[PDB]
Nucleic acid binder design. Structure first.
Ligand SMILES: [Mg+2]
Ligand SMILES: [Zn+2]
Ligand SMILES: [Zn+2]
Ligand SMILES: [Zn+2]
Lengths: 166, 171, 10, 267, 654, 107, 112, 87, 97
DNA sequence: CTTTGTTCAGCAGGTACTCTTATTCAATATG
RNA sequence: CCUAAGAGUAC
DNA sequence: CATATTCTGCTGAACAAAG
């Protein structure tokens, strides 16, 4: 409720203290509750590209890194206007650190991490970080300690590194 | 990291704007106002998803004013950094106090106190960089940084990162 | 009473 | 004091009369849901008169000669006699009129006939008579079945509460029961065919105007009936054995335990 | 210019949450610590820093901005200061409540006396509303004068269960002025309960205990009823000769400094107690100067000091004298006079009043021409405009702006112009006991110094013309104008919900004239018939065939009056002894808008149910009823003017 | 129902509330001489079942407290044995309409 | 029956001098006075004593005491009453304010 | 708000526009017309915004909906097009 | 002229809410004041030209609203605050009807 | 485990509007 | 400019 | 020689008393 000025804990991914508005379940615009899904770098990049191309088609009706950058710059200039410095920086950051190419690989990764039955934030971080070994991932993400077996995490990171392209 | 969240914004429309293109005006004014914006509550707001049909609802006339107050609900993509989170980035600048790394739409400043003693500043090389015994970190160099602090700023945020932990630094 | 014309009482 | 007490009373969109807290004061405004300004004094013909007079006024028999009707009253004056279904309609209509007579005699112990009711049926009947030029000699084009079914449908169309559940329907019937009693008192088969001599178009026009006026007389949600009542009570007090007038009103509103003239009535 | 644009979102207050200031909240919101009782420094030209008029609390001079918000006196709401009290004092408005709370909580261990183990405590705590809960808890726990560290078991009164009680003896607590005295049972020992120990016992009350007493965890804890920090209101609250609140705050600071010096330098407990009592009295009289028994804290001028409670309560207080009812602009008041030649819904407005009262008309392509013409006319002639409100908020006064040249109006601007004909205006006679005593009329500008209203509309107002004054309010927006014309219009108020009968009728000279006109003796020649027919504005233009054709064409009064009655009206009232034929010409029969028979008098055209007014307004609408009022008044007044009526001493002689 | 002659000793009043669901109702013979419900001022009172109360609150969108209140000491409430929370339907011969049905909740 | 007797008393007072007031006004008055299970007097100790909002209650009588009790009890005022909105200077939810007027984009486009 | 909104197919309020509803529609529409709002009716020379709003309402060309609030907070959306103006 | 209590009562009886509001706010005293959603108090330092809103104590700068209340209402609330009472003004419903 | 039998308890007074007239602590005391 | 008092007008 | 302070209306709630 009001609680006047209520004290709160400092956010910490190690403790997974995301926030009161970043809880696991969120009420959608339809009135029901959905699990808070978190997008990895490639998944978020694909979502942004789909949104921008859909906006471009709506306005119209009413791979290598360099050509990708040229195409995204042209599409960004064509679709939206100015004051997109943050958007441009985010887009170039995503294209530079693009862990995946297209829909098939990101879908396979997301369904595998769903089958892992883990926290959405942790699986998104796993899909974002290109770790190599198991203990390395554990020390990179403190929230993974005492949650999954060492062999399973190591093998799933092995398949993720296998799915790495270019 | 990147998330998708359900946001809502109140828009006040003047009586002169109730033409057949009212939906277009509302959709355009939602943009240029929240696209790529920054706030402490949700971090950065980058783009709006599902633009084909944004929920605008009915819209209430403010009494004695005539302006209509719409509560437009939409899906937005956000980038809120979090404490103790490892993320990739690109070095853009170095200085005496530390170096700035480009992570998405934000610049994270890692101070000289948050590096191992083997890594030291070097202004002799042009541009000035940070050189260590085994590796060197220069401009436009990929580096992984762990964010451990977030500072709210005006129309932007400057987080605090580190590479002191194991397997942190240039790849 | 009232007041006026508390209560009664109070 | 009265205005401050009643300042937050309002008629809401479900016709209940609620204060600021949402507490129900009346489940329907004025126990009939009617705007006060749309109420006129009208006479209930069923409650008054004698049983013989009541039968002569309302009872119509298609099979006997004591309470038969003149065949020249209506077009089918010679074919209705000997009918069974139309006699059933008359039987049930007169039974309903008798029930209304008993109910109204129960409601008003003194048998008072003139009471305030929303829609003035008499003026509607006179307007129809003057507009359609009732010659009072040509047999009426109306059929008795038409009269009965039209009255039934008109009662079905007098809606105060629009809900679609048994509670709201029961409340609607209870809200419109008295005006339905008046309507049946006025728009009877004998009275329509003989006293007024409506035609088919005139009868339909009468039904339409009654429905329109009743739907117009319903109280409008958002009416500030509390301040209206407080003012309508306080203002007459300004114009003003047992205490009366301003001191008695003072005593009543204060609910004083001690009163100047505590009197009791024994029957 | 009003208030400039603010980027903060605009919302409407949905809920008001009352409570108490925590001392830390006062210290957090305060922008200064007031220490010096002097309002002005030694220079006597500036506000002393740290004084009661600290510029951080708001600017006392128009020439200077507020030191905190850097805004003018127009914008600056004023920001509170804080006085850190040397010793805690009782809040005058809560002492009784405090006397109850300390009577419900053990004065040593700080716990509620009767826990749920008591039989009646389940009933008491089950109450929902906080006030009733606290009333029950007080009326049951006042009689208990021991903490009861060991109570019989709830399951059975055989074994004893020990709760968190200390077993001490609670004192009987009374109040002697502004202090509480406790008497302990003799093993009575009387001593004054210091405010510090009461605050200490309040702060030790458990959350569950004081939330069962009605207090809230967040908004109002019981220990916040004790004043340790005084929130100093800004100079907007006490504008300047200083205000009474300023002198009271100076006295409070003086007492605080005296107590602080006495405590620091060391003093006998007599002097310390005297200073503490003086501070308590000053604070209490600052918040409430109408304390029973205690003498009023007089001002320097020997008069009682106006406290905050005095400022709020009463007819002239804030709530009743400035919020429920306040003085409003765009209102006029003057003597009224009768005008039989005005319509029922019209009110006569003096030309000067119309030139003063103004309405803002939004400039639109549909009314640019006439608004421009009014702007050209200026405010010194009627009709005209008095102001031009620009879209930027700047206001052009039509006076002194003629030198710069003609003003070019733009769409969206406002022309604040004189009220013209057909402008809906609320019109009132006070006391205004009912809604019919406050009705929307249409302006008719007239060249005389009195309001002019129809004779028939005086009855709802209860207005005569023997010196009565009436009020005129002008709506300043199209929404208010429209709802005023569609809800409060005079024709719509003809039938009163007060008695479901018309409230306006034909009265005074028109009623006598209409009785004299409709007599069977009254026959009207051709010329007077033509004049009377022309006086009916909606007369269809056909001369009715005379009631008598030979040997001389004569129209009866009923025939001419029936022209005023609208077509399609049937009325049939039967008086005492009347038949279908009318030997006495009483009763009333009107068929198809023609008076068949009956003398028209109070029972027909007066404000009675079933009369002509009621029938017409229920058959043809309120507008036609007002038209009937006008037509009847015009024709009857013409006939009475050309016929004459009087009264004298001979009328009282038998 | 316990029907007494003059009065009950208060030492017996305290033990009147027995083990639930058993309830003891005390009535005075002098107070029971005249049946108040036959008075023309007293309208028709009908206790509502739990389903009927639920339906009433559902159809009118009411809460428990928003209903008109009837004390659990009112002579009619004692007459019909109303317990707290139960709603009585009140049938009244109104004069603007023939029948008016109100509802009062026991407190 | 107490409410019926109260209405009869009020009607007798009104009609003692021959004046007539419609049934529904006095019915509303006597229903308000008897809606709490007991006869509520039209006074500060009567209607003014009800959890109907601190701002409304104080505007009648004993203003400062009502404010003090509301502050001590941490009352929440929902601003559903006329007096609350009058004090706060906003459109009361009465008459024209008993509803919200809104705009239909689809209908407006449907016009042209 | 999805729970609050009573579905259109089972609204239970009067289909007739109330005097207060009509007054507020006329006031709001006249206020908008005064501020150069688009007109959806042809004008026959009228210049008063109030009578422009009256002409708009007479032939049902006002694109507003009444959100009638029930005492419990639930509301019904009645379009001015489907409201019957009998008064 | 005094638009007293019972004139307001007559306007309430007429059902004209907007005219009553215009009488009590625009005609007499319309005051725009800033509050915050954390504490309903009017202790919001609002530098409009610099476009900075800050409520000290709550330590917030992004949760500020503006309301239009009569200056008499603002003075009443400030006197209540001076009298150790918090008239916290909240612009959203925390309880259902 | 119930019985009477004295003594103290707390205010409000209708709605507007017009005008006039007096008055802002006295003076002894110290800088 | 404030406060108080008085006189008066319409109910 | 100039500023500073010394009429008109009641029922309970509470207190002493006790077999
Ligand atoms: Mg007079
Ligand atoms: Zn300021
Ligand atoms: Zn204790
Ligand atoms: Zn705050």
């Amino acid at each position: 409720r009001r609680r006047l000025k209520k004290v709160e804990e400092e956010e910490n991914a190690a403790t997974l203290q995301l926030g009161q508005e970043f809880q696991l379940k969120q009420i959608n615009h339809q009135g029901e509750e959905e699990e808070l899904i978190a997008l990895n770098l490639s998944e978020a990049r694909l979502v942004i590209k789909e949104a921008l191309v859909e906006r471009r088609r709506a306005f119209k009706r009413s791979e290598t890194r360099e050509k990708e950058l040229e195409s995204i710059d042209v599409l960004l200039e064509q679709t939206t206007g100015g004051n997109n410095k943050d958007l441009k920086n985010t887009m170039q950051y995503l294209t530079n650190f693009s862990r995946f190419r297209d829909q098939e690989t990101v879908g396979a990764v997301i369904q595998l991490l769903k089958s892992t039955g883990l926290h959405p934030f942790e699986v998104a971080q796993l899909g974002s970080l290109a770790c190599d070994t198991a203990d390395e991932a554990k020390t990179l993400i403190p929230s993974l300690n005492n949650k999954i077996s060492d062999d399973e995490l190591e093998r799933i990171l092995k398949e993720l590194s296998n799915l790495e392209t270019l | 990291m990147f998330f998708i969240k359900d946001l809502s914004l109140n828009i006040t429309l003047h009586p002169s704007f109730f033409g057949p293109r009212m939906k277009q005006y509302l959709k355009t004014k939602l943009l240029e106002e929240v696209e790529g914006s920054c706030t402490g509550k949700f971090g950065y707001i980058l783009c709006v998803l599902d633009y084909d049909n944004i929920d605008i609802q009915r819209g209430r006339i403010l009494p004695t004013d005539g302006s209509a107050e719409f509560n437009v609900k939409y899906r937005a993509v956000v980038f809120k950094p979090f404490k103790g989170e490892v993320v990739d980035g690109t070095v853009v600048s170095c200085s005496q106090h530390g170096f700035e790394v480009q992570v998405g739409p934000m610049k994270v400043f890692v101070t000289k106190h948050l590096m191992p003693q083997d890594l030291t500043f070097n202004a002799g090389s042009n541009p000035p960089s940070y050189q260590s015994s085994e590796d060197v970190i220069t401009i436009k160099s990929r580096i992984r940084v762990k964010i451990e602090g977030c500072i709210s700023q005006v129309s932007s945020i400057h987080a605090i990162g580190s590479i002191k932990e194991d397997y942190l630094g240039a790849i | 009473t009232x007041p006026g014309v508390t209560x009664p009482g109070v | 004091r009265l205005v401050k007490a009643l300042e937050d009373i309002m008629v809401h969109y479900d016709n209940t009369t609620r204060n600021s807290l949402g507490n129900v004061i009346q489940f329907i405004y004025g126990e009939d849901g009617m705007d006060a300004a749309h109420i006129e004094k009208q006479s209930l013909d069923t409650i008054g008169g004698s049983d013989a007079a009541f039968e002569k006024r309302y009872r119509v028999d298609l099979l006997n000669t004591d309470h038969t009707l003149d065949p020249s009253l209506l077009e089918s004056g010679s074919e209705i006699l000997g009918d069974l279904k139309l006699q059933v309609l008359l039987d049930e209509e007169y039974k309903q009129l008798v029930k209304d007579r008993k109910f109204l005699r129960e409601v008003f112990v003194d048998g008072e006939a003139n009471w305030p009711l929303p829609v003035n049926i008499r003026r509607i009947i006179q307007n129809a008579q003057q507009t359609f030029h009732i010659d009072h000699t040509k047999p009426s084009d109306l059929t008795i079945k038409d009269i009965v079914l039209g009255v039934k449908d008109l009662q079905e169309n007098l809606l105060v509460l629009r809900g679609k559940n048994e509670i709201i329907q029961n409340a609607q019937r209870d809200a419109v029961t008295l005006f339905c009693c008046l309507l049946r008192s006025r728009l009877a088969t004998r009275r329509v065919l003989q006293e007024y001599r409506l035609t088919k178009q005139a009868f339909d026009w009468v039904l339409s105007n009654i429905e329109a006026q009743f739907l117009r007389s319903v109280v409008h949600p958002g009416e500030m009936v509390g301040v209206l009542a407080a003012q309508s009570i306080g203002e007459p007090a300004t114009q003003m054995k047992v205490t009366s007038g301003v001191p008695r009103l003072k005593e009543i509103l204060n609910v004083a335990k001690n009163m100047k003239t505590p009197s009791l009535t024994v029957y | 210019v009003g208030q400039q644009y603010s980027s903060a979102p605009l919302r409407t207050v949905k809920e008001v949450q009352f409570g108490l200031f925590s001392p830390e909240e006062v210290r957090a919101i305060s922008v200064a610590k007031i220490r010096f009782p002097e309002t002005m420094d030694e220079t006597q030209t500036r506000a002393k820093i740290g004084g009661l008029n600290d510029p951080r609390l708001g600017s006392i001079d128009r020439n200077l901005k507020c030191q905190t918000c850097q805004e003018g006196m127009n914008e600056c709401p004023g920001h509170f200061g804080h006085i850190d009290l040397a010793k805690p004092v009782f809040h005058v408005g809560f002492i009784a409540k405090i006397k109850k709370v300390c009577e419900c909580v053990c004065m040593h261990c700080g716990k509620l006396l009767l826990d749920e183990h008591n039989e009646l405590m389940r009933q008491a705590l089950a109450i929902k509303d906080s006030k009733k809960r606290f009333a029950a808890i007080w009326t049951l726990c006042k009689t208990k004068m021991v903490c009861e560290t060991d109570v019989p078991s709830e399951d059975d009164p055989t074994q004893l269960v020990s709760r968190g009680g200390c077993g001490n003896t609670q004192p009987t607590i009374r109040k002697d002025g502004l202090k509480l005295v406790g008497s302990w049972k003799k093993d009575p020992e009387l001593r004054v309960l210091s405010t510090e120990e009461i605050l200490n016992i309040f702060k030790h009350i458990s959350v569950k205990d004081f939330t069962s007493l009605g207090f809230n965890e967040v908004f109002s804890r019981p220990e916040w009823m004790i004043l340790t920090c005084l929130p100093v209101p800004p100079p907007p609250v006490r504008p300047s000769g200083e205000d009474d609140l300023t002198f009271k705050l100076a006295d409070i600071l003086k007492a605080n400094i005296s107590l602080e010096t006495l405590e620091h330098n060391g003093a006998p407990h007599h002097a310390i107690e005297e200073a503490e009592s003086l501070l308590q009295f000053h604070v209490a009289t600052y918040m409430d100067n109408d304390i029973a028994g205690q003498p009023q804290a007089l001002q320097k001028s020997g008069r009682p000091v106006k406290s905050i409670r005095a400022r709020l309560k009463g007819k002239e207080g804030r709530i009743r004298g400035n919020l429920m009812g306040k003085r409003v602009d765009f209102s006029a008041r003057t003597v009224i006079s009768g005008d039989p030649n005005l319509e029922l819904d019209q009110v006569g407005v003096p030309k000067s009043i119309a030139k003063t009262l103004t309405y803002p008309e939004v400039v639109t392509p549909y009314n640019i021409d006439r608004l421009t013409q009014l702007v050209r006319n200026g405010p010194n002639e009627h009709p005209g405009a008095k102001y031009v409100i620009r879209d930027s908020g700047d206001r052009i006064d039509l006076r002194y702006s003629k030198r710069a040249g003609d003003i070019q109006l733009q769409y969206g601007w406002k022309v604040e112009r004189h009220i013209m004909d057909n402008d809906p205006v609320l019109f009132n006679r006070q006391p205004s006991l009912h809604k019919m005593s406050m009705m929307a009329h249409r302006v008719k500008v007239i060249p005389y110094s009195t309001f002019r209203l129809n004779l028939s509309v005086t009855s709802p107002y209860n207005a005569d013309f023997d010196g009565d004054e009436m009020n005129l309010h002008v709506p300043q927006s199209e929404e208010t104008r429209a709802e005023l014309s569609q809800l409060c219009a005079v024709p719509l108020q003809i039938v009163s919900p007060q008695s479901n009968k018309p409230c306006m009728g034909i009265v005074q000279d028109t009623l006598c004239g209409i009785r004299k006109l409709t007599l069977r003796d009254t026959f009207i020649e051709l010329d007077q018939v033509l004049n009377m027919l022309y006086w009916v504005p909606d007369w269809d233009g056909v001369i009715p065939t005379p009631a008598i054709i030979k040997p001389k064409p004569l129209w009866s009064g009923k025939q001419i009056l029936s022209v005023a009655i609208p077509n399609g009206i049937h009325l049939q009232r039967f008086d005492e002894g009347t038949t279908l034929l009318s030997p006495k010409d009483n009763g009333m029969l009107i068929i198809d808008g023609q008076i068949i028979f009956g003398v028209v008098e109070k029972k027909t055209v007066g404000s009675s149910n079933g009369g002509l007014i009621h029938v017409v307004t229920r058959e043809k609408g309120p507008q036609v009823c007002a038209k009937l009022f006008g037509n009847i008044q015009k024709v009857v007044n013409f006939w009475l003017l050309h016929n004459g009526f009087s009264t004298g001493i001979g009328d009282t002689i038998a | 129902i316990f029907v007494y002659q003059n009065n009950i000793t208060p030492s017996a009043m305290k033990l009147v509330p027995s083990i639930p669901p058993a309830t003891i109702e005390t009535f005075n013979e002098a107070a029971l001489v005249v049946n108040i419900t036959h008075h023309e001022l007293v309208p028709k009172h009908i206790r509502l079942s739990s389903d009927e109360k639920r339906e009433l609150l559902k159809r009118y969108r009411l809460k428990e407290s928003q209903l008109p209140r009837i004390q659990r000491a009112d002579p009619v409430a004692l007459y019909l044995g109303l317990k707290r929370g139960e709603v009585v339907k009140i049938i009244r011969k109104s004069e603007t309409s023939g029948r008016y049905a109100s509802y009062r909740i026991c407190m | 029956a107490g409410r019926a007797a109260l209405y009869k008393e009020v009607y007798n007072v009104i009609a003692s001098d021959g004046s007539y007031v419609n049934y529904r006004h006095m019915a509303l008055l006597v229903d308000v006075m008897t809606t709490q299970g007991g006869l509520t007097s039209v006074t500060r100790h009567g209607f003014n004593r009800s959890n109907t909002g601190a701002l409304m209650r104080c505007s009648f009588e004993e203003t400062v005491e009502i404010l003090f009790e509301a502050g001590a009890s941490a009352e929440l005022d929902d601003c559903r009453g006329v007096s609350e909105n009058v004090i706060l200077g906003q459109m009361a939810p009465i008459g024209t304010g008993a509803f919200d007027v809104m705009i239909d984009e689809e209908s407006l486009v449907k016009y042209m | 708000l999805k729970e609050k909104a009573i579905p259109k197919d089972q609204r239970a309020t009067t289909p007739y526009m109330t005097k207060y509803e009509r007054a507020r529609i006329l006031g709001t529409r006249a206020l908008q017309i005064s501020m150069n709002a688009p007109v959806f009716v042809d004008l026959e020379g009228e210049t008063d915004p109030l009578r422009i709003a009256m002409k708009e309402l007479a032939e049902k060309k006002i694109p507003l909906v009444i959100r009638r609030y029930l005492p419990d907070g639930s509301f019904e959306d009645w379009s001015v097009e489907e409201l019957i103006v009998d008064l | 002229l005094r638009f007293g209590e019972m004139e307001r009562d007559c306007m309430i009886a007429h059902g004209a809410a907007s005219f009553l509001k215009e009488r009590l706010m625009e005609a007499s005293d319309a005051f725009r004041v800033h509050i915050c959603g954390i504490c309903g108090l009017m202790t919001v330092i609002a530098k409009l030209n610099h476009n900075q809103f800050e409520c000290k104590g709550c330590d917030n700068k992004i949760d500020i609203y503006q309301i239009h209340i009569p200056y008499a209402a603002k003075l009443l609330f400030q006197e209540l605050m001076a009298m150790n009472i918090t008239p916290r003004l909240y612009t959203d419903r925390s309880r259902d009807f």
